Amino acid sequence: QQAGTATAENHPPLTWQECTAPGSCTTQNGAVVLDANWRWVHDVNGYTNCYTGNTWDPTYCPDDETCAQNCALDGADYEGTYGVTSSGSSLKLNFVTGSNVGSRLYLLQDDSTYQIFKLLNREFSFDVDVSNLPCGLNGALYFVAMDADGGVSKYPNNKAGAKYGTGYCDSQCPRDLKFIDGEANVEGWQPSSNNANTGIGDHGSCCAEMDVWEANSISNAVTPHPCDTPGQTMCSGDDCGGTYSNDRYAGTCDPDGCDFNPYRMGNTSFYGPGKIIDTTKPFTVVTQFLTDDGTDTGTLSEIKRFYIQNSNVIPQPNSDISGVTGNSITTEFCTAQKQAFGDTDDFSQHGGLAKMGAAMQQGMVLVMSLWDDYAAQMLWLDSDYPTDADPTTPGIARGTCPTDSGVPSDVESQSPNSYVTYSNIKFGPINSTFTA
Numbered sequence: 113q114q115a116g117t118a119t120a121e122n123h124p125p126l127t128w129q130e131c132t133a134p135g136s137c138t139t140q141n142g143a144v145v146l147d148a149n150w151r152w153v154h155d156v157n158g159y160t161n162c163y164t165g166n167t168w169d170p171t172y173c174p175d176d177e178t179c180a181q182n183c184a185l186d187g188a189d190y191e192g193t194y195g196v197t198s199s200g201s202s203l204k205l206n207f208v209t210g211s212n213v214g215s216r217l218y219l220l221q222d223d224s225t226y227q228i229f230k231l232l233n234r235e236f237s238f239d240v241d242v243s244n245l246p247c248g249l250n251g252a253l254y255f256v257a258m259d260a261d262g263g264v265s266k267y268p269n270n271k272a273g274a275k276y277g278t279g280y281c282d283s284q285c286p287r288d289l290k291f292i293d294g295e296a297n298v299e300g301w302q303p304s305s306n307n308a309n310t311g312i313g314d315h316g317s318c319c320a321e322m323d324v325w326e327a328n329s330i331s332n333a334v335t336p337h338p339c340d341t342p343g344q345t346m347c348s349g350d351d352c353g354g355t356y357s358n359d360r361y362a363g364t365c366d367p368d369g370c371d372f373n374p375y376r377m378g379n380t381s382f383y384g385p386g387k388i389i390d391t392t393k394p395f396t397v398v399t400q401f402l403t404d405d406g407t408d409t410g411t412l413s414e415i416k417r418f419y420i421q422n423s424n425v426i427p428q429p430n431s432d433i434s435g436v437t438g439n440s441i442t443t444e445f446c447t448a449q450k451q452a453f454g455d456t457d458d459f460s461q462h463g464g465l466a467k468m469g470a471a472m473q474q475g476m477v478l479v480m481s482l483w484d485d486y487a488a489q490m491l492w493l494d495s496d497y498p499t500d501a502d503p504t505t506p507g508i509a510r511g512t513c514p515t516d517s518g519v520p521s522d523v524e525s526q527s528p529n530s531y532v533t534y535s536n537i538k539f540g541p542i543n544s545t546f547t548a
């Protein structure tokens with residue numbers, strides 16, 4: 113894709129902190145950029161649509177390569193069009209703004225380069241306000257093994273780059289992306305039957321994904337997802353796997369992950385409105401990526417979680433599922449959880465924590481987003497899923513929401529002013545970001 117010129121691009125600023133020891137942090141002057149897929153795609157000459165609703169113009173885009181040459185990703189009016197604002201260390205993402213739904217943003221090191229985090233033997237903390245996230249919404253903060261430059265050095269017809277939010281990948285091998293690897297996705301494009309703005313093409317973009325935070329005011333999950341190749345790679349067709357291929361298990365990434373949602377793990381009192389972590393008020397989420405020998409070059413062995421609210425430091429609750437022990441993600445936990453829930457162990461099939469850790473060693477990009485779910489209504493996060501199962505069977509119940517909740521047309525109509533706000537990002541050695 114070309115770099116658009118109809119609307120100017122300026123990346124909202126966002127501060128965050130690097131910590132060297134508890135209480136000892138310094139400020140980084142970051143910025144964020146909107147993902148390419150939210151942008152208007154305009155022909156470079158006439159400033160007319162290359163993509164309208166969910167179909168492509170056949171003159172500008174007769175094939176994938178020609179489309180990338182003829183079409184540009186426009187700049188973004190972050191607040192006015194996308195409902196994205198920032199102030200200090202805070203980033204607020206609104207749900208519905210005009211015809212726009214949600215957003216996905218990346219943290220930048222500079223105007224052409226995503227910030228790369230090396231998570232092994234480190235800790236990441238942030239504050240979040242999920243009080244205005246009802247059933248069906250997901251404010252997600254997570255890491256993916258994107259290229260720092262958004263693909264530009266590999267793909268000459270990507271002239272837009274990280275400056276325009278190119279290069280996304282995740283463990284779903286997303287095929288909804290209009291541009292992957294310097295080519296459009298017009299060949300094989302199939303408009304979504306239930307989303308006027310989206311479709312699915314033949315190409316998908318795979319990479320490992322560390323879902324630090326997928327949450328609303330009802331439930332949260334922390335979930336690593338390994339891929340056979342840790343970093344970004346293109347897939348084609350059904351063999352992409354992931355949620356929007358015919359068979360989610362046909363590809364090279366684990367679409368399910370090894371998840372810890374305290375409600376799903378048998379403690380419904382822990383997280384939610386008025387609960388031990390009270391989602392009606394902001395709180396701090398700390399995540400630690402421990403290695404087997406406690407050094408930077410060890411193998412990822414354990415992912416731990418702490419919350420801080422009202423200055424009280426609260427560990428993740430223990431699993432209360434028979435057969436599944438502890439409050440952290442480890443190989444043993446993950447093997448046991450899949451067995452107890454009767455879920456296929458795709459996590460182990462794609463290399464588990466060893467392959468997640470390899471992706472972490474490659475470096476990962478921070479993503480902050482807000483979305484609703486045109487495949488499964490977020491029921492996997494906050495309801496009983498699948499909806500035909502007995503909610504008392506271990507693994508089925510994930511939150512309090514009814515099984516008819518989360519339909520996009522309902523939540524976009526009923527909760528347009530919902531939002532998520534992320535703030536006070538801190539990163540550093542284990543125990544450096546909070547009072548351990």
Ligand SMILES: *[C@@H]1O[C@H](CO)[C@@H](O[C@@H]2O[C@H](CO)[C@@H](O[C@@H]3O[C@H](CO)[C@@H](O)[C@H](O[C@H]4O[C@H](CO)[C@@H](O)[C@H](O)[C@@H]4O)[C@@H]3O)[C@H](O)[C@H]2NC(C)=O)[C@H](O)[C@H]1NC(C)=O
Binds near residue numbers: 426429
């Ligand atoms: C859902 O998960 C939450 C979070 O883990 C869990 O709440 C925790 O419950 C335990 C047990 O009630 C609490 O631990 C006790 O806390 C009191 C007050 O601080 C202490 O006095 C207790 O100390 C005694 O017992 C300890 C062993 O448990 C001994 O080591 C100690 O020497 C004392 O004899 C004990 O630590 C804990 O504080 C809460 N945590 C929070 C944040 O509320 C809850 O039970 C889970 N709910 C369900 C339904 O499963």
Ligand SMILES: *[C@@H]1O[C@H](CO)[C@@H](O[C@@H]2O[C@H](CO)[C@@H](O)[C@H](O)[C@H]2NC(C)=O)[C@H](O)[C@H]1NC(C)=O
Binds near residue numbers: 542543548
């Ligand atoms: C990070 O801080 C934690 C909490 O103070 C340390 O873990 C405690 O370590 C002691 C000594 O082994 C144990 O007796 C406690 O049971 C631990 N508590 C918890 C909550 O795990 C931990 O060692 C620190 N990590 C590093 C690398 O310094």
Ligand SMILES: OC[C@H]1O[C@@H](O[C@H]2[C@H](O)[C@@H](O)[C@H](O)O[C@@H]2CO)[C@H](O)[C@@H](O)[C@@H]1O
Binds near residue numbers: 355367369455493507
């Ligand atoms: O595709 C929706 C959602 O699935 C999540 O995995 C589910 C899985 O679909 C379900 O079969 C299993 O029982 O539970 C897991 C965990 O909720 C996956 O984690 C999400 O990334 C994905 O968006």
